[PDB]
């Protein structure tokens, strides 16, 4: 039997966790969240700066 974790940590991967073991799955999940959180902040800042400009040319 050779269904080892896709990250090569040595433990067995879960088909439900896309071939990852618990720890590696959890690490990937956190990194994916962190990236989108950060990027969504950048977008929000951009949106704020857009609001500030529309408010300026208004009142």
């Amino acid at each position: 039997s050779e269904l080892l974790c896709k990250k090569g940590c040595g433990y067995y991967g879960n088909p439900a966790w896309q071939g990852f073991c618990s720890k590696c799955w959890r690490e990937e999940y956190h990194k994916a969240r962190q990236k989108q959180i950060q990027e969504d902040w950048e977008l929000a800042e951009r949106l704020q700066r857009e609001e500030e400009e529309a408010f300026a040319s208004s009142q």
Binding site: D40, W41, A44, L47, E51, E52, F55
Partner: protein, 73 residues
């Protein structure tokens, strides 16, 4: 399930929601706890402004997902 809504001021709002909840319904909840009128709210998730008539599930917003909130001035 709970989701989190971060503002640009470091504030985090916790919400009790369901995947089938509309964005409009989420905006009403935010109004209940923060007093912000729904029409002033701009919600963001995964690089998109969220449209009032779509669902949380339409954007793959799951348990412990974090959205962002900007206010119209």
């Amino acid at each position: 399930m709970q989701i989190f809504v971060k503002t640009l001021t470091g504030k985090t709002i916790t919400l009790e929601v369901e995947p089938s909840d509309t964005i409009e319904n989420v905006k009403a909840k935010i109004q209940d706890k923060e007093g912000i009128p729904p029409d002033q709210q701009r919600l963001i998730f995964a690089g998109k402004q969220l449209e009032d008539g779509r669902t949380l599930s339409d954007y793959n917003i799951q348990k412990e997902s974090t959205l962002h909130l900007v206010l119209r001035l």
